[PDB]
Structure 1
Amino acid sequence: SLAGIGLTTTSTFTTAAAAKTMIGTIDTALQTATNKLASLGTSSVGLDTHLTFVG
């Protein structure tokens, strides 16, 4: 969620200079979001493997 990735809701850029830092903020947000989703995918594969073994 917006708090989770550090975006901070109701956070915009009022001038043409805050956008120069918003670029980097969105880059970091995208990086950490993709990392979290990769971890979730790994966990799902683990669940599948253990289910097979339990069978």
Structure 2
Amino acid sequence: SLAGIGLTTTSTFTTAAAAKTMIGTIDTALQTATNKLASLGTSSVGLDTHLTFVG
């Protein structure tokens, strides 16, 4: 969610310098969200491998 990726429900920019700061803010948010999704996919693959061993 927006709180979990370093943003906020009211996050915005009202000036070009604020937009230039938001560029790096959105970069950090995209990177952290993508790392979280990668960890979730690795957990899913681990669940499938354990399912095979359990069978």
Please give the TM-score of this superposition, normalised by the length of structure 1.
0.97
Which has the higher mean CA deviation after the structures are superposed, 4-13 or 37-46? 4-13
CA RMSD between the two structures: 0.5
SS, match of residue 20 in structure 1: helix
Give the count of matched residue pairs. Answer: 55
Q: CA deviation at 1:28?
A: 0.2
Structure 1 distance, partners of 2:42, 2:48, is 10
1:6 corresponds to which residue? 6
How far the C-alpha of 1:46 sits from its partner, in A, is 0.1
**1:17 Cα offset (Å):** 1.0
Structure 2 unaligned blocks of 5 or more? none
Runs (4+) of structure 1 exceeding 3 A deviation are none
Note the residue ranges of structure 1 that are not aligned, 5 or more in a row: none
C-alpha separation between the residues in 2 aligned to 1:32 and 1:12?
19
Q: Distance in 1 between matches of 2:34 and 2:11?
A: 21
